[PDB]
Every structure is written in structure tokens, then in C-alpha cells.
Amino acid sequence: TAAIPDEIARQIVLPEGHKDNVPLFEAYRWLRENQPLGQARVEGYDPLWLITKYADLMEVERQPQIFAAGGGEDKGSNNPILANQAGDEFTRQLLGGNLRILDALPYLDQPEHSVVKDVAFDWFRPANLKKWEDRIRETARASIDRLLAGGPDLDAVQEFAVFFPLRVIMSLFGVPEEDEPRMMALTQDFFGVADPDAQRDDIEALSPDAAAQQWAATIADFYAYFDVLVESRRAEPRDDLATLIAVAKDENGEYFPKTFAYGWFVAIATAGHDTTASTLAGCLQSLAAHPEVLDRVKGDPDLIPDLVNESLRIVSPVKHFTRVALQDYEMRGQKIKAGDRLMLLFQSGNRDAEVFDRPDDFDIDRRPNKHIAFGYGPHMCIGQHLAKLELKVMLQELLPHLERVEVSGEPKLIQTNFVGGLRKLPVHLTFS
């Protein structure tokens, strides 16, 4: 019944707690082994049930009528992305009493979530993505040509891994190549709200609500950009994902409000590339630690999907979403009360020893690989099949050209409790 001990709680709740994976994952592990379902009571944050166990992540996510993302009928009464209390108070001042700062899927509950998700559900299905595979492969090959041309010493993140997923999504989305640097800069602002090296110049960086001010400022910039794109595609439809979303109409034949398109566009323009980049960079880091794995996958390219799945499990770049209990609920001998918030720790679920043998080992021979890196339930990642296709295609084209990866300098992670992973991975590559 006791609260989680303060230093374990802070390690997971505070963005600074995620600056180094070793103490973070040790805190995950301490909870899974000693307090698998406890409440973190960190100063400046609401109390949070920390959902650390794989089974409990599934139990919560499969019950959206009990555990809401946005607050149920009181729309925007829960922030699905953990802000501090001061930040949620900033947002309630900005919006007028609620936290629904985007109309994007994470903020929605059923049935609204189901209606909006159905706009793009079919586009994202694996069979409907096959038509993009050749364009993806041409983009991978061009990115690899530049890697070979630039020589063996580089930052595998900022000088390689970031560009391929961004070009893929912007090409499919319909954003011109000259706008990629702007989308990359706003993505860094968006996922860097609490990172000391990613602060915007137009917000008070040291204010208690700084991250929330940066989140809002970045969204306003994305809205200004996407307003032009929505109007453009409504006026002149094209065969791109921007058009599918911009022209979408509800069951009465009326356009969805423009903010619904902007929500899709923010998600596609940020998570649509950043997570794939993180997973690719994490894969390279693991191939440096496990050179026998690189040798094996060059020997059998049919192992590439297994390598992708184990990179997703280990990297798990999307760290959490929050839920709120709409009624009292008992789980794992604990009494969650109506109104209590939950933090879904996907990275911890992915290390649960009840599910994965030697969960901290990089083992591509987990078959099936039961990872929960894409979450679960009706909110399960819509982009999962595009991410797995892009990572497969890039590795099929890249690994033949790599004999060895060496990490030659200190890796750096984005300091976030939300969408993280590497921002820097200095390497020495040996080309074949």
C-alpha cells in the first residue's frame, strides 16, 4: 500500500530520470520485482499508478470503457501525455478548462476515437503499404549512397538515421523536400520539451510550466504550416496521405474540423519518422555490441524482421501514455480509484522476465517476439506496419554494405519521459 519510494518514482516520472538508460531500466526492474503496481507521488505531478508489468499493460489497454485516454465524456479532462501539474494548469489556462490541445488519436476516447481512426485505418494496413515499398527502397538506397560517400566516421543519428524515415514520411505525406528541415526542427521542439539542449527561444525555459509552453508553441507552428496544406489539398486533391486526411468527411458528409486533420498531420510529421529513426540508431548500437548478430543477419537476410522486432523491444522509444480510471478497479491486489491516473510503461513491459527469458539480452531468436513496443488495445500504434516495412527495407539495403559497427564516442539520449531514444551515436563503420 505504501507509495513507491521517492528516488525510484522520480527516476521514471521526471524527464531527467530518462537521461541515462541504465538507472532508468534499473528503476523499471526494481518495481517489477518489488512493487509491480504502486503509486508514484512525485512533487509537482499528480499521483500515478506505474504500470510496469506486461500483463497489466494489456489488462489496462484492452479495457478503454474503464481506463480512458482523454477523460471519457469530459473530453480533455485527462492529458494522455504526462505533463507536470504546472504544465497542465498552463494548458487549462490556454484552452479554457481542459487539456485536449490536439484532436489527434491519443487524446480521443471511443466512440470518437473509432470514427476518427477509421479515416486512415485502411491506408496503414500492411497490404495497402506494399505499393510504397519500391519508393521506400529507392529512398533507403539514396541514403546509403550518401553514407558510403561521407566515409566511415559519423554520428549515425544526425548524419544518417534521421534522414531516411523523414524523407519516407514526407514523400508519402506529400510535404516537399525543401520543407524537411522545418519539419525536423519542429519535431525536435515537440519531443524535446524537457531536454536542456532542445529548448525553444520563444518560451521561458526555466518556468515551472516550460515544457507545456514549448509543447503549445510547437503545436501552433505545426497548425500554421498544416492549415496551408489542408486548404491546398481540399482545393486540389492529390494521391498522397495529406489528401486522404485533408478531405475526410464524417457520416453526415461534412468535413471533419480542420484541427482533426492537423492532429493526424502532427502525429505523422513527428512520431511518423522520429521513432523509426530511434529504432534504426538503436539497432546499429546493438550490432556494435553484438557483432556476431551482424555476421548472422548478413549470412541470412530472412533474419532481418527478427532483428527489427528485437530492436523494437530493446529500444521501445515510445515510453508511455497515461490513462484515467473512470471507475474503481482492483488489479494485482491494489485498489485503483475512480479519477486515479496511470502511466503505461511500455519499456518496462518489454523487460518483464515473466514474458521474456533474459529480458536485457539482445536475442533475435525470440519467436514469436511478444514485444509491446507498439502498445495494445484500440490505441495500438497505427503506424506499426509502416515502421516495420521501413526498418526491414533499410536493413536489407544497408547490412550488405556493413562489415562492422564500432561506437567511437559517447552516445546521447533525448532527455524525455515520452518519445525518446538516441540523438547521437558516434561510430566508426567498416564498409564491405
- Least separation in angstroms between residue 267's CB and ligand Cc1ccccc1Cl is 3
Exactly one of 78, 139, 199, 279 binds ligand HEM (CB under 6 A); that residue is 279
Q: How far apart are CA 62 and CA 60, in angstroms?
A: 6
Residue 211, number of CB atoms within 10 A of its CB: 26
Q: Under a CB-based contact definition with an 8 Å cutoff, are residues 270 and 262 in contact?
A: no
CB of 349 to ligand HEM, least distance (A): 10
Phi and psi (nearest 5°) for 412? -130, 135
User: Which residue of the chain is nearest ligand HEM when measured via CB?
Assistant: 383
β-pairing, 422-424 vs 67-68, is unpaired
Binding flag, residue 270, ligand Cc1ccccc1Cl (CB under 6 A): yes
Q: What are phi and psi of 404, to 5 degrees?
A: -160, 145
Binding status of residue 318 toward ligand Cc1ccccc1Cl by CB under 6 A: yes
Residue 214 or 270 having the CB closest to ligand Cc1ccccc1Cl: 270
Sheet holding 153-155, edge to edge: 153-155, 426-431, 402-407
- Nearest distance from residue 131's CB to ligand HEM, in Å? 15
Q: Is 321 in the site for ligand HEM (CB under 6 A)?
A: yes
**Share of the chain residues as helix, strand and coil, in percent rounded to the nearest 5:** 50, 10, 40
Q: Which helix (H) or strand (E) holds 402?
A: strand 402-407
* Residue 381 labeled ligand binder: yes
Q: Which is nearer to ligand Cc1ccccc1Cl, 142 or 267 (CB)?
A: 267
Cell of 196: 536542456
The residue assigned the cell 490536439 is: 102
Verify cis geometry, omega within 30 degrees of 0, for the bond prior to 15: no
Stretch that binds ligand HEM, among 46-54, 89-97, 181-189, 315-323 (CB under 6 A): 315-323
Binding mask 117-156 for ligand HEM (x = CB under 6 A): x---------------------------------------
Should residue 275 be labelled a site residue for ligand HEM when binding is judged by CB under 6 A?
yes
By the criterion CB under 6 A, which residues form the site for ligand HEM? 61, 105-106, 117, 169, 267-268, 271-272, 275-276, 279, 312, 317-318, 321, 346, 373-377, 379-383, 386-387
